[PDB]
Symmetry: D2
Subunit: 258 residues, 4 copies
């Protein structure tokens, strides 16, 4: 089941992962939806424990190509989970205030507190992704940032944060369909930006960047999971299974005051 966990050997190659792979589930969509429903209930209970224990901090990082399933994952995986204990932090185009400080400043501000589960919809990884691909800074600058991230995450983990980093892996062809579906969708007509067409020619450069990022930052304290995300049902089930298992591993207990 950890066939998707990227080992900290620095020997990662994205070619080994197929976006269309569904080998960890034996049953197809209908069966998987039932399985997800079970895990969602366990997740709801596990969050209730987390909030009650108030010791651990859970950080779920979502990274994907545009239309890679970031919003869809949050919406389906965290369906019915208490709003008081779960929070989404999105990282968009940096403001002048954000650029006036190091790139980790805006990110560090949003980290989960004790008893809180935080989802990062894009993250500090963007500073080794869009920044690298579009050469917003030279290689000399962004190359050093891998060490920064390893060390920043070491600090977070050592101080009590459970870090789960999910790479939602979709094919170039799947993305083409999803963006075309976005353009014909009336309630998604607004989600489209013109820049989505320029980043499309940069596909390979983005894939190279994801390969580099994952190889350099997947550690035992902060592992990367490559989720085959072409099938939404499989993506949702697998992300739920990984999170539920990790949270189960924490052996969280309800406190007693006497």
């Amino acid at each position: 089941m950890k066939k998707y966990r990227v080992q900290p050997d620095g020997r990662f190659e994205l070619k080994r992962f197929d976006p269309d792979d569904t080998s960890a589930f034996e049953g197809g969509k209908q069966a998987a939806l039932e399985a997800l429903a079970v895990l969602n209930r366990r997740l709801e209970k596990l969050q209730e424990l987390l909030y009650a224990e108030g010791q651990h901090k859970v950080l779920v990082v979502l990274q994907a190509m545009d239309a890679g399933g970031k919003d869809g994952t949050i919406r389906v995986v965290f369906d019915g989970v208490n709003p008081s204990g779960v929070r989404v932090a999105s990282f968009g185009v940096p403001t002048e205030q954000e650029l006036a400080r190091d790139y980790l400043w805006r990110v560090h501000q949003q980290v989960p507190r004790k008893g809180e589960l935080v989802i990062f919809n894009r993250s500090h990884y963007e500073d080794v992704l869009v920044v690298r691909v579009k050469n917003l800074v030279p290689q000399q600058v962004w190359q050093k940032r891998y060490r920064h991230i390893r060390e920043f995450e070491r600090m977070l983990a050592d101080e009590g944060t459970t870090i789960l980093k999910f790479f939602l892996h979709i094919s170039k062809d799947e993305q083409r369909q999803r963006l075309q579906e976005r353009l014909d969708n009336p309630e998604k007509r607004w989600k489209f930006r013109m820049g989505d067409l320029e980043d499309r020619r940069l596909w390979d450069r983005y894939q190279e960047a994801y390969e580099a990022a994952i190889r350099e930052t997947s550690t035992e304290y902060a592992p990367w999971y490559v989720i085959p995300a072409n099938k939404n049902w499989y993506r949702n089930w697998l992300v739920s299974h990984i999170l539920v298992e990790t949270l189960e591993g924490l052996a969280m207990q309800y406190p007693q005051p006497e």
Copy 2:
């Protein structure tokens, strides 16, 4: 259904509201749960519109006595609503940093942005509630805050925030049972502090403080709704109905 909206006539009496009242729903639990399921789906859709339109700011304020149903309301009313568009801000015991600035500073920081629905689990109201009851500041101070709160909410509303204030009204006897269940439940035991028994002795002063605040701060731009909260099913349905109707009233539309 707006028999629960507190009119801005400064003539409200809490006396007139029974925590055990269920008169706005023509039936019981089983039927009300079905009704809530329908409103929850509408709520999910209305939030989706809010986030997409990205113009309005929605502020839901929850105030209640301890074990009055604040966590329960958030959990049930907002079940299945997109986490990206909904946020809870809890107000606890003020820190030294928080006390070093005016009481509205910590609260103003958490207000909803455009396209966001924020729930305040306890609020700036505590500064005319626990503060008043325990005399954490003298009367001279906390008396002036009613005007502050009216004017701060006028500003929020004028600048595009839809404000819904819910008072979850439970009986002294219901609280006694709920707190006893907290002591008799291992998965509830944790929410308990010894101070929950002390505040119990201050019941009437807290009730007097709630009546006072609601009378002073329920306005046309920021109304107070007194929710009979003894029955969870009725509490959840009624808060959902009021929220859904208010959000419907905004005539929100998806962008072109």
Copy 3:
């Protein structure tokens, strides 16, 4: 010198104030520099006592036209005052994050804490100034802001903030010279933006905007002082005098051992 405090009668008139007026000081520059040196020393001591007492919050609001002397006031008036107790908060062009919430959100965040003296270099007033002049929101919206401002400042004052609002009043002709002097000084040329010229075309609308804000928001708890700011030496001495006297009035005492 109470001749500069704008009474809360709602009958303020900016034509009654001359930027070139120096009548409150019985002398010129050389004598005023000496007088300012005395007040600056008292200000340094008063700040030490504010920080020590740790109860009051002091908010100094500076509003002026471009090249009206806001930065020079900070630099000279607060010279030698302990950095640990004094802070500047500047308000610029609002970000999308700042615009996504009410206009008072970014301003409320910067308010002085207990024992702190804060200077606002531009403020929440901007939201009834540049916003009004350039119609960034309609009249329907910015008209209601005067009440918001009065009530927000009432709340700050009631809760322990001493509020001093200074309008640094310069003439249209003085601004023309200063802006020209900016374009000629290499260590100042960087402060120049093309907008400084576009806003100069809007002089009168800005003046009308200042008369309206001052008339509407000068209260007992938060007064406005119209400082004739054409002469730097007079501007610096008069703001120092007003601040020092206000701080003296607080009769601040050292904590009980």
Copy 4:
């Protein structure tokens, strides 16, 4: 100077530094005050350039024992420097909100922005000092924190922050006098807390904690300077000299960009 810069060799021994040392200055009190006046003027001009250029991020970290001269340094070194470009961030006893996140969260929030000079009056170092001495977390937990700091400061420096860390070194005897003077002074008594006598009792444990911290975190990108701080005049001149020289080294330039009618 490089005699006070702590080399990144991990062989630092605080015993090699005398709080009463004044060897870098030839002239005594009167001559040093004149020298400081000159450096203060250069500092004022250098800050004006920093704010105008708006590219560099400057972080001055002040660490000292109680009554070690932190407030005194800020007050004298930064005298007359424009408030708009200089900010003090003090770190006291953590709040429940601050404790609910990692210890670097509150500190990272206060880092200088572009064109700003920030002074940290106590810092993230407190989390390997008072925390270590009073065992507010176990050794297993605070031991890992040296690497965190090295790496956090590497990130800050790599991304554009000039980091100056000053350890204001006073003797046990000097502290005893200053604490007593605070007590007898009516305009200083207010600074006193009962814990000042507890942080006096643990002197050696604190000194051992400063030795370990400085030894572990003085790097090329973020050096530690041990300032002999028994003499205020020498302390003030030396911190001013180090800061001015560092700022001079940045070779800051004013930006480059019509008849007004």
